[PDB]
Every structure is written in structure tokens, then in C-alpha cells.
């Protein structure tokens with residue numbers, strides 16, 4: 001029996017609208033000892049409002065059981081630690097896992113917008129670049145828009161650890177060269193805890 | 207039941223420069239204090255091959271000692287896709303654990319290299335970001351470097367490759383230079399090394 005503990009998604013902790021959760025998943029649970037005991041703690045004080053799902057049988061004849069603790073937004077951003085303790089009778093002792101926001105002082109991302117190389121204009125598609133740098137921690141959401149509407153043809157790199165201990169990434173939006181030269185305003189949205197209202201945008205045109 | 211293999215490929219740059227030495231490596235971990243002995247056989251497209259060297263034992267903190275074997279490989283062998291087979295043989299092991307590895311399969315494709323200067327908005331900073339976009343390349347093994355007046359720049363960080371919707375890959379490299387260095391108008395270049403380039407190498411320069 002092994003335990004995996006998963007944090008909330010970056011966006012869910014940054015908007016009060018949404019519901020951030022920590023997810024504790026136990027896999028390889030026996031038929032012969034199928035009962036699973038979860039305890040949850042916050043900064044080590046036990047907490048009692050987690051909602052655990054009925055054990056679900058897998059095709060390799062093991063159970064998987066999931067317990068979900070709803071996390072208040074400001075506890076997570078205030079750095080609190082979430083411990084899932086898993087008990088089952090096949091185990092020498094309870095397994096414990098702990099997750100929290102990465103420790104360190106938050107740092108505000110700089111968002112900078114970057115049109116295609118001159119040399120790229122010969123192509124039928126063009127690459128709109130959004131650099132986001134100098135952020136901490138690395139939890140961040142990045143989206144592209146034009147005229148209030150999502151652009152869906154973009155890819156974003158993972159966060160990369162910079163030499164100052166902060167993080168950067170690039171997001172690349174690919175558009176038709178027509179749309180670019182029409183034209184035309186493109187918007188890179190960025191949400192992060194160290195930004196006011198946890199949101200900024202930066203737009204891009206010819 | 208006891209220990210386990212991990213089996214890593216050559217560095218991309220070593221496969222593409224005929225003067226570097228590309229190596230296939232095999233880190234064993236969690237090794238025996240009972241029947242501690244280890245062996246290795248190594249196959250290249252079925253055919254066993256003896257020109258490989260086992261690095262003597264390394265130590266460890268938490269017990270159990272590593273046992274690597276590092277086989278050198280032909281440039282051309284690797285780039286043609288031959289398989290590299292790390293056949294282990296530990297006694298306290300129900301059977302001889304195996305791992306195999308080769309370059310990713312598929313038509314190589316040439317990277318397109320673009321160079322993007324700092325945003326206006328960053329120009330009010332004591333540091334500035336020179337951006338090298340590399341896109342459209344396949345396989346994802348690639349080396350990216352930066353230089354000025356034929357000297358290497360240290361202060362860059364490069365993104366891992368990301369799968370694009372093409373089924374090709376892209377990455378960005380960020381070079382950080384003092385704003386004075388960019389305003390006086392020096393020349394900086396992003397070097398890119400990849401299979402599908404001519405001579406395995408192109409450069410793209412960036413200035414104002």
C-alpha cells in the first residue's frame with residue numbers, strides 16, 4: 001500500500017470563486033486487509049471535515065481509495081502544512097505524507113510580451129511570446145486571449161529555476177500570419193499569488 | 207526482488223560532435239550486502255559487445271553501494287537508432303534485470319531558430335532578457351548555447367523541450383545581460399545543435 005498526496009491547482013487557490021483541494025490517494029490496498037483509515041492534520045492539528053470516497057476496485061485486483069480535504073485559500077497561501085495519515089492493517093505503521101506551498105518569500109512576476117522574429121514572417125503561422133519571469137513560488141497560471149475570447153492554440157513551458165532562485169517560463173501562442181497583420185490585439189493573462197488581485201494581463205499587436 | 211536499474215542515454219551534444227564521447231550509462235542503486243557482486247552484459251541490436259567499462263563501486267549514505275558500467279558509443283550508431291541493452295546479472299535477483307534504449311524514432315526535423323530582443327517594458331531594468339526561440343524540431347535532443355564576440359556567455363537558462371501540437375518540439379532560451387551591454391549594442395548569438403541541421407549547428411545573432 002502506497003500513498004500519494006496532491007496539492008490544489010494554482011488557479012483554485014488564487015480565486016475565491018473556486019474550491020481548492022488536497023487529494024490523498026492510497027493504491028495497492030489488499031482484498032485481505034481492505035479497510036483504510038485516514039486522518040488529516042493542518043499544521044499538525046487534526047481536522048475532521050475531509051470527505052472520503054468509497055473504495056473502488058481496480059483491474060489488477062487492488063483497491064484505490066481517495067480522500068479529499070477542502071483547503072481554505074488563505075491557509076494555503078499562508079503556508080500551512082497538510083498531512084494525510086493512512087492506516088491499514090497490512091502496514092508496519094501508518095504512512096504519512098505532507099504537502100504545502102513551497103517555502104520562501106513570494107515574488108511578483110514580470111510579464112513581458114514579444115512579437116515574432118522578422119525572419120518568422122515568411123511562414124503561414126506566427127509565434128507570439130509571453131515571458132513571465134522572476135516569480136516565486138512556481139505555482140502560476142498563464143492564458144492567452146484576443147477580443148475577450150480565449151485563444152486555444154498556445155503551449156506553455158514548465159517553470160524553470162533561474163539563477164536568482166526565482167522562476168521563469170515562456171508561453172507561446174501560435175496564430176495565422178493574417179490574424180497578426182490584420183490586426184490585432186492578443187492578451188497574455190497571468191495569475192499568481194504575488195500579483196494584485198492575483199491577475200495581470202499584457203497585450204500584443206503589430 | 208532486491209535492487210533496480212536506471213538506464214540513461216548520451217547527452218545530445220556528445221552525439222552530434224564527432225570529437226566528443228557519447229556514453230550510455232546504467233546506475234544500479236540499492237545494492238547487496240550479502241551477495242554484493244554484480245555483472246553486466248551489453249548488447250547493441252542483439253549483438254553483444256565487449257568494449258564497455260564498469261566503473262568501480264561507489265559508496266552511499268543510507269547503506270547499499272552503486273555499480274554503473276558506462277559504455278561509449280559510435281556517433282552514427284546512436285543517431286541511426288540502434289538499441290543499447292544494459293543486461294544486468296545479480297545473484298540475489300530472481301532473474302537478470304534488463305533495460306534497453308535508443309534515440310526516439312521518427313523523421314528528424316530541422317529546428318527553426320528565432321531570436322527576440324527584450325520587451326520595451328523591461329528596458330527600465332538593470333538587467334535585460336535576450337530570447338532564443340527554437341521550434342519545429344524533432345527528436346527533442348538538442349543543445350542550445352549563447353556567445354558574444356566568440357566568447358561563451360554563462361548567464362542563460364534554457365527551457366526543457368515541450369511537445370507542440372505538430373508532434374514537433376519547441377523550447378526557449380533566456381540570456382540575461384546588463385542593460386548597458388545591450389544599449390552599447392554588442393552582438394550576442396544563440397547557437398543551436400541538432401541532428402537535422404547542416405553540420406549539426408546553426409547560429410542566430412541578436413543586437414539592436
Ligand SMILES: *[C@@H]1O[C@H](CO[C@H]2O[C@@H](C)[C@@H](O)[C@@H](O)[C@@H]2O)[C@@H](O[C@@H]2O[C@H](CO)[C@@H](O[C@@H]3O[C@H](CO[C@H]4O[C@H](CO)[C@@H](O)[C@H](O)[C@@H]4O[C@@H]4O[C@H](CO)[C@@H](O[C@@H]5O[C@H](CO)[C@H](O)[C@H](O)[C@H]5O)[C@H](O)[C@H]4NC(C)=O)[C@@H](O)[C@H](O[C@H]4O[C@H](CO)[C@@H](O)[C@H](O)[C@@H]4O[C@@H]4O[C@H](CO)[C@@H](O[C@@H]5O[C@H](CO)[C@H](O)[C@H](O)[C@H]5O)[C@H](O)[C@H]4NC(C)=O)[C@@H]3O)[C@H](O)[C@H]2NC(C)=O)[C@H](O)[C@H]1NC(C)=O
Nearest residue numbers: 006007008009020021022023027028058059060062098099
Ligand atoms: C494496480 O492498478 C493501479 C492503477 O491502475 C490504473 O492504471 C493502469 C496501471 C491500469 O491498471 C488501469 O486500469 C488503471 O487506470 C496502480 O496504481 C498506481 O500506482 C502508482 C504507483 O505504482 C501511481 O504512480 C504515481 O503517479 C503519480 C502521478 O499520479 C497522477 O498522475 C497519474 C499519471 O499521470 C494519474 O494516472 C493518477 O491518477 C494521478 O493523477 C492525479 O490525481 C490527482 C488526484 O485526483 C489530481 O489532483 C487533483 O485533481 C483534482 C481535479 O481533477 C483537483 O485539482 C484536486 O485539487 C487535485 O488534488 C491530479 O490532477 C492528477 N493528475 C492527472 C490526471 O494528470 C506520480 O506522481 C508518482 O511519481 C512519483 O513517485 C514515484 C514513486 O512511485 C517516483 O519514482 C517518481 O519519480 C515520482 O517521484 C516524484 O517526483 C516529483 C517531481 O518533482 C516530486 O515532487 C515533489 O513533491 C514533494 C511533496 O511531497 C517534495 O516536497 C518535492 O520537493 C517536490 O519537488 C515527488 O515528490 C517525487 N516523489 C514522490 C514519492 O512523490 C507515482 O508514479 C499511480 O498514479 C497509481 N495509479 C492510479 C490510477 O492511481 C497500481 O500500482 C497497480 N498495481 C501494482 C501492483 O502496482
Ligand SMILES: *[C@@H]1O[C@H](CO)[C@@H](O[C@@H]2O[C@H](CO)[C@@H](O[C@@H]3O[C@H](CO[C@H]4O[C@H](CO)[C@@H](O)[C@H](O)[C@@H]4O[C@@H]4O[C@H](CO)[C@@H](O[C@@H]5O[C@H](CO)[C@H](O)[C@H](O)[C@H]5O)[C@H](O)[C@H]4NC(C)=O)[C@@H](O)[C@H](O[C@H]4O[C@H](CO)[C@@H](O)[C@H](O)[C@@H]4O[C@@H]4O[C@H](CO)[C@@H](O)[C@H](O)[C@H]4NC(C)=O)[C@@H]3O)[C@H](O)[C@H]2NC(C)=O)[C@H](O)[C@H]1NC(C)=O
Nearest residue numbers: 212214215216217228229230231232233235236266267268
Ligand atoms: C538511498 O540513497 C539514494 C539517495 O539519493 C537513493 O538512490 C536513488 O534510487 C532512486 C530509485 O528509487 C532514484 O530515482 C530515480 O531517478 C531517476 C533520474 O535519474 C537521474 O536523476 C537523479 C537526480 O534527479 C540523479 O541522482 C540520478 O543519478 C540520475 O542522474 C543521471 O545520471 C546519469 C549518470 O549516468 C547521467 O547520464 C550520463 O551522464 C554522463 C556524465 O555525467 C554522460 O552524459 C553520459 O553520457 C550520460 O549517459 C545523467 O546526466 C544524470 N541526470 C541528472 C544528474 O540530472 C529516474 O530515472 C527514475 O524515474 C523513473 O523510474 C521511476 C520508478 O523507478 C518512475 O516512477 C519514473 O516515472 C521514471 O520511470 C518512467 O517510466 C519508466 C520506468 O518506470 C521508464 O520507461 C521511463 O524512463 C520513465 N518515464 C517517464 C519519467 O516519463 C527514478 O526517479 C534516485 O535517483 C537514486 N539516487 C541516486 C543518487 O542515484 C535511494 O533511494 C536511497 N534508498 C532508499 C530510498 O531506500
